[PDB]
Each structure stands twice: as structure tokens, then as C-alpha cells.
């Protein structure tokens, strides 16, 4: 019996008592050391993104310490400091063998935390297939930087990877939230040249400039498409990454990308003509990549100072009782907030 | 001064007389030996697909004999039997260096015939960059089979190529017109296993069965999506090729393709969720591939009996005066018609 | 306690008694219905390819029926007719997540049969990770055709896949043994145009002509390189697949492939210059692909009549006692032998 | 009639006077503003790398100003400051349509400077297909940095591109010459994690540390293979780039790369086993990339401060007469020399 911050119903949250999870032969029990609320939790609680839930613990971004393992777990033991990916696929299924985007398949059943399984906002949580999902966290990486790996960094970096960025190419990132900031960082990591970031919030604009954006487009000089086309002298961009917005941002991305380019869509929750190139494009989407290898490679990127995700963390809280406060801060989204982190 | 079948205005066609085209240093003049009307010509004439045109010769699918060449033309001489691609890109521009889909770039200005330039339905027509566009036609290939190469075969085969077909994968082809039939043939050429063809016309169904379709889905038996999902026992298809229909066929293709799959759109003229794989897809579109290398490789495929496009030709006409009759047949689309060919 | 045909010390084979294998929670026990000796077994026994072995049952190409399964096996039950791949990777390790060639990784520890584990030439054998390795065999596929799938078909088809074959490209297959014949079939399945097969044995030449080879090069007519260059008028081939021979055939393959082409090496057991394209090549090698998905896709290819591997089977034997006779036939390769099959 | 620094014969070098080149309709005449000798010139002169030459002007790395153009040249006019790529392919032949490595084909005939055509070490030189080869140089890029683009930067960056580097992967660079330093920079630009540089010269080691190398392996501390395997704890590297050395470095690269990895060979001038992964590798080689688009993308990388190639320049000379001194310095290869540059 442990504590957990759970969704009572659509629009209701509170602290409840639940039975302490037990690990199977291939599972592990992890207690969190640092957690971070996400906009997905808010969409679930208040927008009914995944339907109706009752007494479901929220949260899917945690860095924790292993406290219990199954009998068949070999690579991790209690006391090990680990990074828990947000997506934890089932690896004992032939579906994982299918594979796409140069990674493993079956990445639809991996979205378990806070969807069909208790989240990380508790004293303990359950990780399936621990040897296939968990990754060791070196002691030289701070907790606030490490907690950005499980969801934000992996989603943004996969958005950059799917954009088919060539060396020196011009890349546009629509939406400069945390996922968009990580998309800018990933575009820089892919050898992009000019990077155009679309956004208006001063703190997000400063973060985008820090992470490698060379041009900032504000939705006050005029339409986004006109500004971007004027920036590139009518040539457009080689690739665009969609990280936030509404359906109009998809039309804008189609408008601004050159024929043969790629539009990557990682934002969670027309006709072919001879004289118009708007339909001569590739649109790739997916919240695919999770697992131990992905986490290990991101950890290697952080460890060797290729990227510093600490700039995403604008608010730091101490103690278990501040999870609700961080969630509320995520709800009302003040102007100076990018991503809050609770250190346990 | 020569004759040609031209679009008088939106909805008006007739035989007009025009000045004989002259070739530049890198150009060639070709007289046609076999031509084929397309649905694109009908869309331009009667649906205003490309705007208003005046006395513009129609047609973009011809097999012809070189009549005269420019001073800088080296690989072709008058008397050579050649295949003229529908797309003839400008090759003396840096745009062709920015390629995609493992071919050259600049494949938007290549759509010249019957769009911004006189078509092939005349006694002569003009081909730009002859050494980079024309391809030699061996005498062992019949004219009716060869005339299917310039547009239908290349479009269908590129649709199959962009679908990312793996060996033994299940492929669905939506629309079994000539482009869809060539898409079925290309899917077979890419090592597909089960091929599901969606269509109802008996002649097109017979052609699809001939070209490698193992299952036929008729829309007179219920929704396409439900039938296809029943055929695959709820697994869906690995890839889908869109060759005809309306915007609802795009939704059907998105519904039937498994997560991580590819939807290829060669038919000329959702939100990311944890529990729904509809948005976890790749959509590739383009009427890209033209030029001499593409024509030569298709000619090699025909020559070595890898594919026989003669089944597409259901009506054969002799004489220049039958071009109007073939165009009218294309307009009224009778029961037994797939593709008419006029032999000069 | 069951019977098995085993290698005794070296150059010595015989029938021995061994303890009947028992399955783990994720394993299954399979009895064979059809088996096929391989040249790899002969290299192991007589050439010391893998070192010294004692009482090790040989054979790695079997089609069998499930006899019993572990408690955690869900997709297969006793009585099911299955195809057993030659490569059976360990799937409960993070190594398979790495991945290459658009398939799963860790395909080095999968070579277990007759290498570090008892082979299939016994009354029973052990298959690890049954739900991830075994594949259902439909009743409409004959045993002789099905037993070509586990090693020959997968190796040849992966050789064709790694060759980066484009539609209509010219492909050369060096060595027309069973793996080379399957490479010819795979090249045809990938949309190749001209296919040049290099070999001299009349039965293998006939099989190569059946599987899609358009040109046959005999080494009794001069050097292979000179003949191939004469066939292509000095242009060379777009890709080459090496299926048999020594380092000299690798040198020939480097010589005959055009700059930028790919040489695929699936045969088990230069300096960069401005004016010479010999080193401007890509050489891909690997006995990679194994597992349930690979077997299922190959089974789909056979089921839908995309390929008929029955032409490989030249000798058919009945009864358990004929395994030694088939192995001896494999040893002293006669004129009319391609692949012997023993039906149980 | 102009002066030029030419190779008199094998081992003989001096200043000669030659007729001033004249441009064709698609050509341009360029006078150099900064030039850099290369090891390729020394191999040509003192080692007979390309055979015997008589009065052939050397040099293939220049940044210059357009002096005059042909009648068909449109994108460049006299007075324009341009970057001249070392490889200048013929763009009016169908061969460029073939294409590989996601760029254009026909790149073997692009190696013209100081091979089959007068080099850049003269008062003027000839550039074929100016609109397809030349690239505008912004005034904000210094000459010393810009002159590293034509050969060193493009070769190293293509070596990094062909290595198939994934985010966070470990990359080894064998050879820490200027091409190897640019390979380290390109590996960093591709999102590599740990980068291991193999070299011993202190100036080259310092440059490698500057460009992103995290580990340095000195051959005075034991075998390279053993040191690298100890660094990675026996796992090896995900990819290796060969930029200098002898045939033993290829064996070392094969030994250190993990199965399924890629070895890229850009340094100008095993059998498949079940238990050994040495042959389960991909070897890619080529001095491929040249042309206007490549130069423009590299210029964009330099302009937006993604890479600073000024660290390569250790010796700067002023005046035309110092070309011989720079060439001699390249011959003697002193301790503190990486790349000399002559500013005109
Ligand atoms: Mg993905
Ligand atoms: Mg992973
Ligand atoms: Mg295309
Ligand atoms: Mg072409
Ligand atoms: Mg493989
Ligand atoms: Mg598999
Ligand atoms: Mg290349
Ligand atoms: Mg270029
Ligand atoms: Zn999240
Ligand atoms: Zn058409
Ligand atoms: Zn075998
Ligand atoms: Zn050089």
C-alpha cells in the first residue's frame, strides 16, 4: 500500500491509496527520484483524451532507483539508478520484429504509463521487461537533466530524425514548446544549417536561441507562411517539424516545405497537380521510439556534452507533496514556465 | 506548319494548324508513331485543371521517331526510334542536383507537354534536352506496349517503389485504372505477397488478376475498409497505393494500413494518439520520375519479359484522324475501355 | 533418449544415442517431417570450419511438427506444422534492439543448430523462443518446397535485398549453387531486368534459366570478367551477388560492378583512385536474417506462387536411415545433384 | 598567356608559362584568391599516382573570383566571389542521372583539376559547367576558412555521412590528418556520442580534441585494436571512418566495428563465419561528392557557425611566389604543419 497522485475522474485529481505493485519474473519495481508532469496528463484529466479513468496514477516521465526485480532479471539489481522511458513496449511478441524507422516495431502497446497502467507519480511503479526497457544512469548526469530524456528529448530527436535532414539543410520547427525545443536541438545534432523556430513566448524564444535556432518567427508580423517564405526568399525550407499547434499548422508546413521534402509530425493529441508542389511531399508521424537502447543512446548524448536539456527546467520543486503543485502549474501554464521538475 | 489536335478553350477541342516547332542546340524534333490519350487531358479540357488554354496541342504519351536534332545533340540522330517520357525536366539547372526518392530533382518543371508546351497530338513536337530525356526503343517491343511506358507504367511503378514494399508483404491498391494496374504490376515486381485490388469494372478486374492481384474487393459488397480488414483478419496491409478515387479513399487507406506503414499517393488531380495508430503513418506522394534513365530501365523491364503492358490496350485505332475519336472515347469512358492507342 | 546423426570427432559421422531434449518455459520440442543436408555441415565435419566437436547432432534445415511446448508458449501447441529457421536468435536480450538492414539485431548468437547446439538430424530437437522463431506452415505447401525456406531461400533473398536492386537494373549472380539460384530468384523478385548467372553445371544452369537468368556465363569460354564486360558492352552490372567461390570471385565482382554499385556477399565460409572506380563500391556481407517474421514472409511468397523452390530438390529420400546417404551424396557431389531432401 | 605552377615530370617541378584558357558557352574563367596544396599533388608528382604528366598545372583547392563567363552562363558574372569544388562533374551527360548515396552520379569524370586538366595554381583556370559547379561565397566567410571547403571538408563530411551514424553512436576515426579532422567534425555534426580519434601528432591531436574527439588513441601505447577494444570494454564501435594509413588500418577497422556496422573509406590513394562477425560488415568507399549544391550546403554550415575549419590552417603565406614554398612544406611535412594556405 503506497501513495500516488491519481486521476479521480474527468476533471478531478487527488491523493489516493493503492496496493503496492509486485514484479513478475521479467519485471522490476522502481521508486522515483525525479518526476515531471506533462501536457499529456492534463489532456487526459481535463480533455478526455483517452476516455474515462478511475483512480489511475498519472505521470510517465521519471528517473528512479530500482528497488525490486524479478527472478529472470539479470542486467539490473536493487539500488541501481536508472532512466525509465515513457514508452515501454512488450518485447516477448513477434510484433516487435516488424520494425520501421530503423528501430524495433510494436511501438503502440508500449504507451502503458498513465494510459492502461499506473503512472510514475507514486511511491513505486511497475516496469515491464526491465532488461529490455531500463537504462543505467551515470552519476555525473544531474537528475533535472536526466528526467528530460524519457519523453521530451526522445520525441524531439525522433522528430528531427524522421525529417530526413541533410547536412547544411534549412529546417523549420513549428511550435517551440519543450518538444519543439528538443526538435531544434535534434536538428542541430543532425547537421542542419539555418534553423527557423516559430513561437512567441519570450522564455521559449530564449531557449530556442540557446538550442540552435538562428531565426525566430512571431505570429505578429503577419502570417507564418508569408514570414517564412520571405526569410528564405521564396525557396522554402528543406524540412519542417511539427511539435505543437492545430490543424492549420499542417497546412502551413505543407505550404513552406519544398517539393520532395519531409514534414515530421510529433505533436501528440491536397491533390496532386503539375503546377503545384504542395502534394509532392512526404509526411511522417509517430510517437514511436522507446526502450533501453534509445535511452542509452540519449544518455550517451547527454554524458558527452552533445546536448544540455537542463535549460528546459524552469521550475524545480522539492518533496513528494509538490507533485500536485507542479501539475497545477502545468494546468494554468504561466508565462515563465517551460517544464517543472519535482525532486524526491 | 503542321496540324495538331488542340484544346480550343475550356470544353472545346478541334483540329488547328500551327507553326512547325524548331529545335535548339540541345533539342530534338520528334514525329509520333503511336499516341495515347489520358484522363489528364480530359481534366484540363473539361474540368479546368490547369486553367485557361488557347490553341494548345494536347497529349503527353507518345512513341516516336527522331526527325531532326540540335547541333549539340550526340546520342540521337534522325531516324532513331525513341520513347518520349511524359515528364521532361530541365537538366541544365542546379535544381536537378537536389534529388529525392533516389532519383534526380527538379521534377516539377518537367511537366511541360500539354501544360506549358504543345503536346504530342500533332505531326511533330519538341523535346528539350534530348540526350537527357529520350531513350532508344528496341525493335522487338511492339508500339502498343511501348506507348504505355511514358506515363502509366512509370507512375504506377513509382507508386510501388514509394510504398516501401518488403518481400512477402501484403499490399493494397485502391483504384484499378491503368495507373492502378501498373501499380499492381510494380508491387509484384517489388516482391509483394498478397496483393488486394479494389475495383468493380469487369475488364479492370480481369486485368488486375492478370497483373498479379490475388484478391478483389468490390464496393457493392459493403464498405471497402470492413472488407479489407475482414480479408486480413484485422491485421491490415503493410502498404497501400492510391491510384484513383476521392478524398474518402485517403481516409480508407489510413484506416487499413498498419502502424509504421506507408501510403503512396500517385492519383493525379488525423491526430497522434496513444491508442490509435491512424496517425502513425508515412504518406508519400509525387508524380516525380521522368527522364532517359527511367525510360531505359522501364524498356529493359519490358524487353526481358518482366512485365507485359499490352493488356492495358483495349482499343487500337489507325490513322491521324482517329485521335479525336480516341479522345471522345476517353471522355465517355465506355464499359470495355481501359486505354486507347492510336497507331500512326 | 532418441537417435541422431552426429559428427563424432572430425571426418567421422555415425548414429548415436543422446538424451531427449527438454523445453524451457519459452521453448518447444519439434520432431522433423523433412530435412535437408547442407554444405555447411560438410565443411564442419571434414574441413574443421567451427573447430572440434564431439557427438554433436548435425543439420539446420528442417520442417517439423511441434511435439511439446513450455508453459509460457502461447502461439504454438503440439501438433502444429511449423517451419524452423536455421538462425534462431535470442530475443530476450537488448542486442536485438540494435538492428540493421531493416531487420532486428543480434543475429550472430542465432546460429545455434549444429554449431553450439544439437542439430535437426534427430528424432527431436530443441527450439529456443518458440513464439519468436517458429512459423506456421500451411497445408497447401509441399514439404520439399517448404524445407528450402529455412536457409537457402532466406540467404539468397537477403543477398538480393542487400544488393540494392532498382527496377530494371542489371544484376550478376556469381555462383549458381542453391544459394545462388535463390539469389537469382530474389533478384527477379526485386524487379531486376537482365540477370547474368555465372556457372557451368548443366543442372544448375537449367535451374538458373528457370528462376529468371537471362544470360549464362561459362568459365570454359575465357575469363569471367571479360565475358561479363563483353555482354554489357563495357558498362558492367548495377549490382553483383556473391554466392560461391574464392577471393578471386570477389576481385571479379569488384571489377564488374559500376562505380557506386553494391556487391552483396552471402557466400558462407583496392585503393581509392581518381581514374579507377574499383574502390568506389559498397560491399555488404552477412548471414543475417532469421526468425518468425522472416519465415512467415517467405511462406507468404511461396503460398501466393511468387516463387517455387521445388526445382532445387533433385533427390528425394524416404525414411530416417537415409539421412546418412543424403549426407554422403552431399559429400561427393555428383553431376545431377543440387539439394537432397529426406522425408520422414 | 599566364604563369602557372606545374609538374614538369615525375619528381620535377617548376614555374612554366602557358596559354590563357578560354571559356566555352557553359564555362567560366576564375582567378584564385586563396589556394591550398594537397597530399594528392605530392603523390602525383613524386610517386606517379596518376602516371606521367608534362607541364601540367597542379592544385585543386581554390577560392576565387569569376573573371569571365560563357554566353550561356546565367547565375554567375565577372567579379563574383565563388568557391570552386575539387570535383567538377560533367552535367550534360545522362550518367549523372544514375546517382547514389543520395546525390548525383557520374562523379568519376568530375576529377579533372590537376589530373586531366590544368590545376588552380595559376593566374587563371577553367571551370566547366559553371552554373552547375560554382557556388557563391558570402563576404562574411574568411578566405582561409573557405578554402578548406572544396576538398577536405567535403571528403570528411561524406566519410561521416556514409558511416550511417545514428544519434549517440560511438564512432572511431582512423587517421587524424585534415580529412580525418573533418571526419571527426562531420561525425559530431551527425549526432555521434563518443568519438575516438587515432593519431599521435600533438598538433593533430589538439585539432581533433577541438573538433569533438573525446578519446585519443596513440599507437605508441600498444596495438590500436587492443586499445580501442579496451576503451569500449570489448563492445567495439558502431562505425569507423578510414581517412589515412595503410592496408593494415582496414583490417583494424574490420576488427573494431560491431557486426552490422559500417566502415567508410575516404582515404585517397575475410570470410563469412557463424562465430566471427568480421565479415558481417558493410564497407562503403568513394571520393564522390562534388558540385554547386554540395558547396552551397557546406557554405551554409560554415556561415551559421556549425563548424569552423580555420583550425586546419597552421601556415599562411602571402603572394603568388609562395606556392612553391607551400608545396615544399607539404613535401617535407614538418612537425607543426596541418594545412598551408596561400593568400593571393
Ligand atoms: Mg519511429
Ligand atoms: Mg530501444
Ligand atoms: Mg519520386
Ligand atoms: Mg531519368
Ligand atoms: Mg541482414
Ligand atoms: Mg524475423
Ligand atoms: Mg558518395
Ligand atoms: Mg552538388
Ligand atoms: Zn510526456
Ligand atoms: Zn497521361
Ligand atoms: Zn544451410
Ligand atoms: Zn585535395
Residue numbers in the entry:
A (entry chain D), B (entry chain C), C (entry chain B), D (entry chain A): 0 to 268, 277 to 351
Paper text:
The obtained experimental data revealed that triazoles induced the aggregation of Thermoanaerobacter brockii alcohol dehydrogenase (TbSADH) to form a gel complex; however, its stability was very low. Intermolecular interactions in this gel were strengthened by the synergistic chelation of metal ions. The active center catalyzing the asymmetric reduction of aryl prochiral ketones is mainly composed of Zn2+ ions and three amino acid residues (H59, C37, and D150).
Moreover, the cryo-EM structure of EAG enzyme provides a structural perspective for its activity enhancement. The large motion of the loop consisting of residues L107 to H100 with a 4.1 Å shift at residue L107 and 10.5 Å shift at residue H100 leads to a major structural rearrangement of the mutant. The loop motion further induced the side chain flipping of residue W110 with a torsion angle of 94.5°, thereby expanding the substrate-binding pocket of the enzyme. The larger binding pocket may promote the conformational sampling of the substrate and increase the frequency of productive binding modes, thereby increasing the catalytic efficiency of the enzyme. This is consistent with the increased kcat value obtained using a kinetic analysis.
